[PDB]
Paper text:
pmcDeoxynucleoside triphosphohydrolase (dNTPase) enzymes are effector proteins in animal and bacterial cells that hydrolyze dNTP nucleotides and inhibit viral replication. We therefore named the dNTPase-NTase anti-phage defense system Clover and designated the dNTPase protein as Clover protein A (CloA) and the accessory NTase protein as Clover protein B (CloB). Likewise, CloA exhibits strict dGTP substrate specificity, with the activated enzyme only hydrolyzing dGTP and leaving other dNTPs including dTTP unaffected. Together these results demonstrate that CloA is a dGTPase effector that senses phage infection by specifically responding to elevated dTTP concentrations associated with viral replication. Clover defense encodes an accessory enzyme CloB that synthesizes an additional nucleotide signal p3diT that suppresses CloA activation and protects uninfected cells from aberrant nucleotide depletion. p3diT binds to CloA in an allosteric site adjacent to the dTTP binding pocket and raises the threshold of intracellular dNTP levels required to trigger full Clover immune activation.
To define the mechanism of dNTPase-NTase regulation, we determined a 2.4 Å cryo-EM structure of the Salmonella enterica dNTPase protein. The Salmonella dNTPase comprises an N-terminal HD domain and a C-terminal α-helical bundle and forms an octameric complex consisting of four pairs of dimers that arrange to create an architecture resembling a four-leaf clover. The clover-like CloA octameric assembly is formed through extensive interactions across three distinct interfaces. First, HD domain helices α2–α5 interact between adjacent CloA protomers to create anti-parallel dimeric units with α2A, α4A, and α5A forming primarily hydrophobic interactions with α4B, and the α3A residue R46 forming hydrogen-bonding interactions with the peptide backbone of the α3B–α4B loop. Second, CloAAB dimer units multimerize through interactions between the CloAA C-terminal α-helical bundle helices α18C and α22C and helices α6A and α17A that interlock the CloAAC dimer. Third, the CloAAB dimer unit interacts with CloAD, forming pi-stacking interactions between α12 residue H263 of CloAA and CloAD thereby stabilizing the CloAABCD tetramer. Similar to canonical dGTPases like the basal E. coli housekeeping enzyme Dgt, the CloA HD active site motif H117 and D118 coordinate a catalytic Mg2+ ion along with residues H69 and D242, and the HE catalytic dyad H126 and E129 are positioned for substrate dGTP hydrolysis. Interestingly, in contrast to SpdGTPase, no activity was observed with CloA enzyme alone, suggesting that Clover dGTPase activity requires recognition of a cue that occurs during phage infection.
Author numbering:
A (entry chain A): -1 to 14, 29 to 172, 177 to 469
B (entry chain B): 0 to 15, 29 to 172, 177 to 469
Amino acid sequence: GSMHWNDLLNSNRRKPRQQIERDYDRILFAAPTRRLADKTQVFPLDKNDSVRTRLTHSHEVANLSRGIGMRLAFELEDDVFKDVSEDICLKRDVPALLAAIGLVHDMGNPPFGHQGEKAMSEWFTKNLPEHSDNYKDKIYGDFRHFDGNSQTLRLVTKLQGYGLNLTYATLASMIKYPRSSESDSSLWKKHGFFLSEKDVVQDIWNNTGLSEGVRHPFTYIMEACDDIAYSVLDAEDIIKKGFASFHDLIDFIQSNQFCKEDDVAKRVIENCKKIHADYAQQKLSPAELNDMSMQMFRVYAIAELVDAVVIAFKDNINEFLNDTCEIKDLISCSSGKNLCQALKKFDSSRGYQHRSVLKLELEGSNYIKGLMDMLWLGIKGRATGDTQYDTPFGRYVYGRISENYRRIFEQENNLPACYKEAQLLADAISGMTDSYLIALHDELRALHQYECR
Amino acid sequence: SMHWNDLLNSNRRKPKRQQIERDYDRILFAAPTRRLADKTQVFPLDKNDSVRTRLTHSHEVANLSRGIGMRLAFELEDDVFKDVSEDICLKRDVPALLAAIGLVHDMGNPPFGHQGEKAMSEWFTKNLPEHSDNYKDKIYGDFRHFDGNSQTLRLVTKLQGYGLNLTYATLASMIKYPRSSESDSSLWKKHGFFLSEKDVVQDIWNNTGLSEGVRHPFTYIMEACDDIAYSVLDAEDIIKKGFASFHDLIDFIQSNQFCKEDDVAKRVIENCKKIHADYAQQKLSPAELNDMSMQMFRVYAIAELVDAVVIAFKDNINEFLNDTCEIKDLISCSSGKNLCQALKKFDSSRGYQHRSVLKLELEGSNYIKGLMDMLWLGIKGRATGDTQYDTPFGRYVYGRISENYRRIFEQENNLPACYKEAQLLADAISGMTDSYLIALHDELRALHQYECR
Ligand SMILES: [Mg+2]
Ligand SMILES: [Mg+2]
């Protein structure tokens, strides 16, 4: 069985310019997209150094995906789009679809970078014990292993009961891991949607020809663009902040075990050496020379990695279009896997373990866990029938939660009451920016003095 | 007349996908583009509000321009683009070109909104007297009537002899007002480039078939998209911040003298009234109902204004391609001019004159003028020869200026010394963000205590 591009590019919407272009416009004009500007990506955003935030990273991923779609729809059309209905305009739909899924991919991630997800998962693991009878079911893993992709899908499908009313193609491409926490798929080790979205994704799977464990072909492209953006622009930011030099990056790539014989890595290194041989002649500050060489390396590396990803996607298009697809990621099957791995290693060694990043992660973990404690004081028991929340502090912290999250929490559905409370807490925490989370944590800590003692 | 072959010149100024797409890619990854996220657009940046910044406004304008380009290249190609070489791929160039010029249109604008430009102009008028023999030429008007478009062109052309190396089509499109301060024309009341770029612009005009007073056709589209974004999105921000309600906007449009018996305004009003009546049934908080109604109004108004702009551009394409074009703006020749004027009046009455915006403007003016005084203390005389600047405070404030601006200032050219010093100050002030400008102002004020008295 092979999936068809007519179903994968379904322009219909769940609620009973091209449609996909309108989807991209709605995603861009959405409030969470603008809120992404205040969410930390890797490095602290308080510093005035033009460091990457979630919004800038999302826009870069969207641009890379749009360029890949441009190449796919204009150059390699007959190679990958073999059987497409005439009413579908690939040149207008594919770039727009890739740009939209790139822009929206990190919309539901919690603040404070990766430490946000890690802290939420740790708090949920501690406060929703797996041995306890209330939180024994695997569905609560949705919070014990909380992931931003499921929250993003929930945000785009249930927050407004259809949300932004994205097309089926967009929603299908949003699902990064086609399985839930209840599922036991060996191919994917992470859940891609919550239990509350279990019906919705099913509807998507009923309109795009997809099923559990089967990924949309454009999801691979979006993930590859995300990985490329991470690996390249994190290194660029590392050099920009002065945590390392361009020569340090070149030496790290050259001395990497898998990049000594890698053709792409050697080509990039040679081109960067040639350019740096000319950039040093002009009178430039060491920071200025580092920035120039870093920009040139970014251009070369992004071009090479994007070309390798496009080639890999074109070569493995038949495997992607088949339901029995075992490809993990597009980078791993491409010729640029070694360079991307080396860049990720460099980013981990030089940027992710720097003093500033570690301090930011520690502060984010502290803030998130404290705020989750104070909010759980007012959330727990609301749906299970208990009354322990009915305190002035509990009422206040419940009133501080955004009204849409509370409205979804006070609804009739098959979700267990404990699951509803945990989902309310997760929705409240995930949608917060760094500054808003810190301010709310400080205010609640100030107001909690009597009840805490 | 003018041919599209020259207007869409993909050649780059520096002597030696698509080139024009590469222009948008380079603009997106530029550091000042990321710095735009820290510059206020109209309203101050809060910790919770999703008000537009310069970056979000630029992205919205770019999206609108890209949609216009898709409509022009995919539907109205025969009506708009006649006698175009088969080498030029309109479907890939026109949308990319419009998006690139929309994203870059506000790169060089000073911080603190429009008050930034106003404060820079007032300070330059006071400290560069027109009666003083040192400053009598019209060239110093470049600073007495400082404009963000000229600084944007300067940044893209002379900041990295070439900067981003944008194509000739892009550079021609970013010239909003095709005239200089020295040249006096009744067509345009503002200068579009500095004296230092006179040779660059003359080059661009040579490679695009344009001339003084003749504006690139896509500049009209970019300006129309900028105006539409300004009006509609500022109204949306006003509603979101709570300064006015959706019913207030509806009443203002209905009670507007020109918007009466206006087809576009009536259509938008009726559609929004029906949608609001439908929405009122759902139990939502007043803020939520206002947000939903304003979002639907934004969708309807943006669609109507964009369609009117497209129709006006298509109808007047022959005049736009003529060197004797007398059109001042695309909106005024469209059917949506009345709605745009009413929206601008509503924004001025409720948003721009709100106490928060007035306080932001006053603080920005104070900060900008104080910092300009303290920087002029260390800049003045560096090029004329007089050595009042050679003080520890002057040396420090000169060292705090960005190295690239200082390097351009120290270059030997035909610019007068006073012009070079004023341009150094303008480049320093314009490139700062709000927070960085405030921090530098506080630092210098702390360090200026002894030398002040
Ligand atoms: Mg990402
Ligand atoms: Mg603008």
